[PDB]
Paper text:
In this study, we experimentally determined the function of a putative protein, as a novel [name] (PsAly), whose gene is found beside two characterised chitinase genes (chiC and chiD) in the genome. Bacterial alginate lyases can degrade alginate into oligosaccharides or monosaccharides. PsAly preferentially degraded the glycosidic bond of PM over PG and MG.
To determine the structural characteristics of PsAly, the crystal structure of the enzyme was determined at an ultra-high resolution of 0.89 Å using the single-wavelength anomalous diffraction of selenium (Se-SAD). PsAly folds into a right-handed β-helix structure comprising 10 β-stranded coils and one α-helix cap at the N-terminus, with overall dimensions of 26 × 28 × 52 Å. A single disulphide bond was formed between Cys42 and Cys47, linking the first β-strand to the first α-helix at the N-terminal cap structure. After refinements with replacement of these ions on the sites, the Fo–Fc electron density map showed strong negative peaks in the presence of calcium ions on the sites, while the map in the presence of the sodium ions showed no such strong negative peaks.
Author numbering: 36 to 333
Write the structure that this text describes.
């Protein structure tokens, strides 16, 4: 690191973020809860990232908001942050990224969130969340309780840049207690990857159409080598869906190598609705039952 800033109070962290520089290593004391609405605004580079991390993993540092009904645990608006080994809780959103790029989130535990756990928004691209667990979301609004939310609905494209592109979700556990989709990939996004992840469907509510592990409304999504457990939750109607919200979106979704445990024969593995298009290969369904619906090239 170029500079080490060791913090054990919220005031220390707030100051370290305000004064953040490329190459900073902001190291948060184990066992401490840092309460605030913390803002990661500066930008690093690939060679000089800005790091916020827990000092160790026995008792990770916690970033808490003030109330599940407001704010965020962390709001990232700059590029080239490494956010590592932290817990995030106690806010309306866990981590919100606005126009933030090349952010690496690793080893996070994000839980007890009013709305959505992680949201890539306003053009935030080329980011990764890996080796993390998101659970207990949608405590305030179930229908806004996604685990991971990529991009913006069409009604917000005039407000936020829709092109939250090439974001990667790798080796993540989502659920239980995630009230909406585990992953909602919005129209306007391109190239989202969801890989090597595990979906515990207990707690998906069905609110606001949220009745699958993943809904794919963006393009060029790659959904590979994941495991989904419906766990008898009747609110889950399909493992994965693809929808067209705007013509030419919900296109070219690829589903390979996934294994889904859907309890009964009725849920589909991939339900590509209407004009949506997908390709599928190597997916395993338990028990025997419905596989693909729609324009699915199998
Ligand atoms: Na749905
Ligand atoms: Na949703």
């Amino acid at each position: 690191a170029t500079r080490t800033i060791s913090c054990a109070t919220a005031s220390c962290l707030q100051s370290a973020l305000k004064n953040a520089k490329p190459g900073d290593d902001i190291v948060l004391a184990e066992g401490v809860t840092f309460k605030g609405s913390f803002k990661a605004e500066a930008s690093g580079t690939a060679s000089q990232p800005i790091t916020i991390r827990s000092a160790g993993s026995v008792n990770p540092a916690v970033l808490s908001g003030y109330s599940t009904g407001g704010g965020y645990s962390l709001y990232v608006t700059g590029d080239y942050w490494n956010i590592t080994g932290l817990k995030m809780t106690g806010a309306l959103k866990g981590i919100m990224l606005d126009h933030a790029n090349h952010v690496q989130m690793d080893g996070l535990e994000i839980y007890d969130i009013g709305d959505e756990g992680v949201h890539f928004r306003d053009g935030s691209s080329d980011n990764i969340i890996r080796n993390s667990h998101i659970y207990n979301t949608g405590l305030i609004e179930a229908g806004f309780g996604e685990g991971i939310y990529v991009g913006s609905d069409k009604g917000k494209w005039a407000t936020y840049n829709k092109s939250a592109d090439r974001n990667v979700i790798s080796g993540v556990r989502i659920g239980p207690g995630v009230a909406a989709e585990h992953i909602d990939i919005k129209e306007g996004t391109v190239g989202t990857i969801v890989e090597n992840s595990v979906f515990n469907g207990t707690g998906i509510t069905g609110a606001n159409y949220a009745d699958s592990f993943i809904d794919v409304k963006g393009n060029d999504a790659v959904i590979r080598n994941n495991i989904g457990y419906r766990n008898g939750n009747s609110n889950i109607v399909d493992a994965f869906q693809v929808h067209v919200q705007v013509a030419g979106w919900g296109q070219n979704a690829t589903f390979t190598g996934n294994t889904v445990y859907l309890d009964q024969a009725a849920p589909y593995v991939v339900n590509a609705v209407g004009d949506a298009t997908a390709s599928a290969a190597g997916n395993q369904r338990y028990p025997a039952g419905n596989l693909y619906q729609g324009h699915v090239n199998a």
